[PDB]
Structures are given as structure tokens and as C-alpha cells.
């Protein structure tokens, strides 16, 4: 509901009602006349942040594997198969 | 004969590359590396000195060699000085560099794969053969088939293209075997304050015969090598010779023709065989890595080096650098097995350095080893020496930007940073 | 010796019938997706579904309307 609320009132102009009506004016007029949020890179920077997050995407992969082997009950099992 | 490299396919690089020829002297191009194009002294060279063979790694062994040799590389500056070819293990090395290098955070550790590569082998050299100083030259990649000649790399960052002599076809070998004697005698830091000499270590990946001289040419400039157990080639040769404990003719030729049954010439096979022979002679330059075993390449790569400190003196002086080498891997488990049994002396003025360097470091482990192997904080701490420790702060950590502060507080109130 | 020619209908098989770990192993032994991957190996795929699962009947549902508004079953 706080991320909602952000949002809402990031995308809102900046001044309260009544005196909206300027905003709403201006905004009309440049419309007329003429974000921190949902950005777009350049290649070579999105590129670069795709790789970024396959290389953290293995990594946590590799952890979840990693504590799995070291499980007791992986241990376990390898022991009695080993033992047998 | 400098030049730039533009490749041009599914990722853009760029990629730095020089012309050189068999009678170069090795320092100029040391010198081109480290000045011209920026990189700074290795603290680690891993040599591949296979993978060009027809038969390749086997699918899970090449992916544990290419992770293990990653992480290893990662943890300092290190150089894979490999045949900057697209093709092989060679491929899969340059794509695991160039994967790490994109998603590192630290930009002052770098993994640089650099590619020595013969001029007779590159697929479109006119192409490159431009290399205008202000456009870089458009190379397009292509994945050839085994053939005889190949495309470069696009993941290779820096290239050094030998042209072939006309004495003899092996122009690349002995530059490739002068290059890595070069940087075995060279320092790690940009000064000799806090450096060691650079720790050069070759990789054997399913060998053909036609590189054993090479091999023992190395061995001969005493270099560590590398064995991969599950390779293929050479290397199963030798790691089968390591598990027997001896070597005899008929024995090692017998292994020569079942592992080769292609090769069928008497001289070429008894010269063979004194080859392997005299490289295992020496063994304590041999180390075999067996992923189905151990799976830590650092690890064989620490215990080869120290291996081959202890076979060359005993003295503690030597064992410093490999001591040095332990400390930045946080292997105080293998520098316990390994420096710290019995036979090396070390003094308290023997470890300051090192104990300052696992100090600043945050290496605990190693600071509780050489407190216990008699450094004496009593003697060793003083209050320059605190005062030192505290100015080589990290500069990333909140105790810096608070010290900062203070001293620009102290400045506008108003040898050493703090 | 494996090429990716030779998977190329075994890889079909594993992929059809779930079976993830073979899928695994086909490609770590060569079998390159980008290669392999076509649109018409796509849309084969989406046709030889289970007829048993719950895309199978969505699928017919949206068929079916298409055929009221107006090679492969999908």
C-alpha cells in the first residue's frame, strides 16, 4: 500500500488543490504549445546489468547447491551409501 | 605495430592487439603491456597450454575447470595467457573472463585474458590488418569448425599476434615459453616495497605430442605446471605415470602408442619418450588436479607454488612470497600444512611484513597463526604502527568517510592521512 | 563423439515428454538453444501438448473461437 501511495503521489503535480488548477493549466499549455521510475539505458549499461544479474542469479544457485550438499540429511546419505 | 579492435557480432567489444615477431626481446612487450595499454603487474599468470586437439574437455569437467579457474583468478589481478583463438577450452575460458569482468564490482582487481596467437592461424587478418590509430579495425566473428585456422576471440581483451619464423613452425611456442620466463622474474607491485616476484603456473589440457618440447622447455626455466586428470591427452599419460611412482621406456611407450595410436614413427616416438622421462624427473614442478577429488583450483594452484618454493630452498625468505600468496587467498589451512610444518625457521622480524599485510587485509585466521608462531603484539605493535594501520583504511568503509570528516573538520579549524 | 545433430530429436523427445534432467544434459553436451530454437520448432512444440492439461484446453477454447470468427492443431 506505501509503494501504491508513492507512486501515486510521485506521479502527482506539485501543488495541492485548489491551486491545482495552475498545474493543470500549465500542463495543458505546454501540451498544446510542445523518470526515477521505469528508466531506459543505454546498450552498453543494460548490457552490462543483464550480465550483472545472471552472474548473481549463478551465485545464489550455487549457494542453494552448495548448503544442500552440507545438509545433514545430504551428509547422511552420502555417508550411508559410502558406508554400504 | 599497434592497433585496436572493434568486434562486431551479438556483443560489441573492443580489443587491443600488437604485431610481433619470434627475434623480439620479451621486455619490450612486457613493457607494452603494463604502459601502453594500462594493465597493471599480475599477481598470478595461469598459461592453457592445450585445447587445441580435435577431442575436447568433457562437457563437466571444462565447466568445474573454467568456474574453478574463475574463482581462483578472481581474488587477485591474474592473467590467462591462452591461444586467443575462438575455439576449444579457449572459447569457454574467454567467455567466463568477459562474464566476470562485466559483473565485477571492483574495478580495481581485473581478470585480464590475454591471447598469444600465431599470424598463420587468424581467420581474416586483413581485415585487422588496418588498425588505424584513431579507427580501430572492424572484426567480424565467426565459430569455424576445428579446420587449421580460426577467428579470434571476441572475449579476449588484449592480443599478442606472433608472426611465424621461417626457421622453424614453433615462432609461438618459444615466444609464448620467453613470455612467461619474462614475467617470472618480474615484481607484483609497481614497486619492490610491498611485491613479490609473479607467481607464473602453465595448465595442461589434453596435450599432443608435438608440445612436449615446449613443456620441457618450461619445466627447464623451473615453472610450475598444471595436469588435468580427466584431459585427455598428454595428461592422462602423466597423471598415470604419477600414480605408478615410476617411469620406465617400454612402460611410457607403451602408454605413448595406446593413448596415440596415430603417431607411428620410431624416432619421433623414442624422443617422445626421453622427453617424458625427462619431465618427470623433475616432479616437483608437476602437479596433478583432479576435480573429481579435490574441485578447489586455488587450492592445487597454492600447493603447487609452495611445492616448487620448497623443492628450490628452504630458506624463509623464499617461502615468503608463497607466504604473501597464502595470506591474499585466505588458505590459512594450506599455508599451515604447507609453509608452517616444522622445517622452515621463522622469526619474529620474519613475519612483521606478512603479519602487517594479514593485518590490513581483515584476515583474521592468519593474524591468530602468526600470533602463534611467535609474534609478540607487545614488540611488533607500536603506536606508529597503530597510527599506520589506521590510515589504510579501506576508503569503502563507514570508518573512512568518519575519519574523512574529522579531518576536514580538523582542516578548517586550521606526511600521514589520518 | 556427440554433435548437435545427432540431439536434435532426441532433445525434441526429452523436451516434449518433461523430462528436465536429460534437457539439462542435452545441453550441456552441445545442444546450442539459440540454434536449435526455431519459431516452427516453437510452435511444434505448443502443438504436441499433453492434450491432458489445463493449456490444452485453453488452447482449444481460443482455437475454437478463432474458428466461430472465421496443418497445425495449434
Given at each position: 500500500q506505501r509503494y501504491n501511495l508513492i507512486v501515486e503521489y510521485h506521479s502527482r503535480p506539485a501543488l495541492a488543490p485548489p491551486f491545482i488548477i495552475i498545474s493543470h493549466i500549465t500542463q495543458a499549455l505546454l501540451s498544446f504549445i510542445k523518470d526515477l521510475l521505469e528508466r531506459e539505458l543505454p546498450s552498453g549499461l543494460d548490457q552490462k546489468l543483464m550480465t550483472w544479474e545472471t552472474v548473481q542469479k549463478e551465485n545464489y544457485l550455487a549457494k542453494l547447491e552448495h548448503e544442500h550438499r552440507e545438509s545433514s540429511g545430504e551428509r547422511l546419505r552420502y555417508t550411508s551409501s559410502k558406508v554400504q | 605495430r599497434l592497433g585496436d579492435i572493434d568486434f562486431t557480432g551479438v556483443s560489441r567489444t573492443r580489443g587491443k592487439f600488437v604485431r610481433v615477431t619470434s627475434s623480439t626481446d620479451p621486455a619490450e612487450i612486457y613493457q607494452i603491456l603494463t604502459k601502453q595499454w594500462g594493465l597493471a603487474p599480475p599477481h598470478l599468470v595461469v598459461a592453457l597450454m592445450g585445447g587445441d586437439e580435435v577431442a575436447q574437455?568433457?562437457?563437466?569437467?571444462?565447466?568445474?575447470?573454467?568456474?574453478?579457474?574463475?574463482?581462483?583468478?578472481?581474488?587477485?589481478?591474474?592473467?590467462?595467457?591462452?591461444?586467443?583463438?575462438?575455439?576449444?577450452?579457449?572459447?569457454?575460458?574467454?567467455?567466463?573472463?568477459?562474464?566476470?569482468?562485466?559483473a565485477s564490482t571492483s574495478p580495481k582487481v581485473r581478470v585480464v585474458a590475454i591471447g598469444i596467437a600465431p599470424w598463420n592461424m587468424i581467420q581474416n587478418r586483413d581485415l585487422l590488418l588496418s588498425a588505424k590509430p584513431d579507427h580501430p579495425a572492424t572484426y567480424p566473428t565467426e565459430?569455424?569448425?576445428?579446420?587449421?585456422?580460426?577467428?579470434?576471440?571476441?572475449?579476449?581483451?588484449?592480443?599478442?599476434?606472433?608472426?611465424?619464423?621461417?626457421?622453424?613452425?614453433?615462432?609461438?611456442?618459444?615466444?609464448?615459453?620467453?613470455?612467461?620466463?619474462?614475467?617470472?622474474?618480474?615484481?607484483?607491485?609497481?614497486?619492490?616495497?610491498?611485491?613479490?616476484?609473479?607467481?607464473?603456473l602453465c595448465l595442461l589440457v589434453h596435450?599432443?605430442?608435438?608440445?612436449?618440447?615446449?613443456m620441457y622447455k618450461n619445466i627447464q626455466n623451473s615453472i610450475p605446471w598444471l595436469i588435468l586428470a580427466g584431459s585427455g591427452g598428454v595428461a592422462d599419460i602423466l597423471v598415470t605415470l604419477m600414480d605408478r611412482g615410476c617411469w620406465d621406456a617400454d612402460i611410457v611407450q607403451e602408454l605413448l602408442i595406446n593413448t596415440f595410436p596415430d603417431g607411428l614413427?620410431?624416432?619421433?616416438?623414442?624422443?617422445?619418450?626421453?622427453?617424458?622421462?625427462?619431465?618427470?624427473?623433475?616432479?616437483?614442478?608437476?602437479?596433478?588436479?583432479?576435480?573429481?577429488?579435490?574441485?578447489?583450483?586455488?587450492?592445487?594452484?597454492?600447493?603447487?607454488?609452495?611445492?616448487?618454493?620448497?623443492?628450490?630452498?628452504?630458506?624463509?625468505?623464499?617461502?615468503?612470497?608463497?607466504?604473501?600468496?597464502?595470506?591474499?587467498?585466505?588458505?590459512?589451512?594450506?599455508?599451515?600444512?604447507?609453509?608452517?610444518?616444522?622445517?622452515?625457521?621463522?622469526?619474529?622480524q620474519d613475519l612483521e611484513e606478512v603479519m602487517m599485510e594479514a593485518l590490513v587485509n581483515d584476515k583474521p585466521d592468519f593474524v591468530r597463526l602468526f600470533v602463534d608462531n611467535g609474534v609478540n603484539?607487545?614488540?611488533?605493535?607500536?603506536?606508529?604502527?597503530?597510527?599506520?594501520?589506521?590510515?589504510?583504511?579501506?576508503?569503502?568503509?563507514?570508518?573512512?568517510?568518519?575519519?574523512?570528516?574529522?579531518?576536514?573538520?580538523?582542516?578548517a579549524q586550521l606526511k600521514f592521512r589520518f
Open positions: - | 574437455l568433457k562437457p563437466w569437467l571444462r565447466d568445474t575447470l573454467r568456474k574453478g579457474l574463475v574463482k581462483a583468478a578472481q581474488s587477485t589481478g591474474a592473467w590467462i595467457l591462452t591461444s586467443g583463438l575462438r575455439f576449444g577450452i579457449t572459447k569457454n575460458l574467454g567467455q567466463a573472463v568477459r562474464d566476470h569482468s562485466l565459430d569455424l569448425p576445428y579446420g587449421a585456422v580460426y577467428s579470434l576471440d571476441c572475449n579476449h581483451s588484449h592480443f599478442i599476434l606472433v608472426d611465424e619464423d621461417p626457421k622453424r613452425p614453433g615462432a609461438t611456442g618459444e615466444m609464448r615459453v620467453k613470455m612467461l620466463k619474462h614475467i617470472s622474474l618480474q615484481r607484483t607491485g609497481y614497486g619492490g616495497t610491498g611485491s613479490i616476484e609473479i607467481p607464473v596435450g599432443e605430442p608435438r608440445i612436449l618440447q615446449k614413427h620410431s624416432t619421433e616416438i623414442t624422443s617422445w619418450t626421453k622427453l617424458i622421462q625427462r619431465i618427470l624427473d623433475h616432479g616437483h614442478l608437476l602437479t596433478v588436479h583432479d576435480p573429481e577429488q579435490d574441485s578447489e583450483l586455488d587450492t592445487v594452484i597454492l600447493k603447487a607454488l609452495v611445492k616448487a618454493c620448497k623443492s628450490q630452498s628452504q630458506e624463509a625468505q623464499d617461502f615468503l612470497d608463497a607466504l604473501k600468496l597464502a595470506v591474499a587467498w585466505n588458505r590459512v589451512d594450506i599455508a599451515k600444512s604447507e609453509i608452517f610444518s616444522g622445517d622452515v625457521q621463522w622469526s619474529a603484539i607487545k614488540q611488533f605493535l607500536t603506536y606508529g604502527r597503530l597510527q599506520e594501520l589506521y590510515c589504510s583504511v579501506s576508503e569503502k568503509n563507514l570508518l573512512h568517510t568518519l575519519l574523512l570528516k574529522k579531518n576536514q573538520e580538523r582542516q
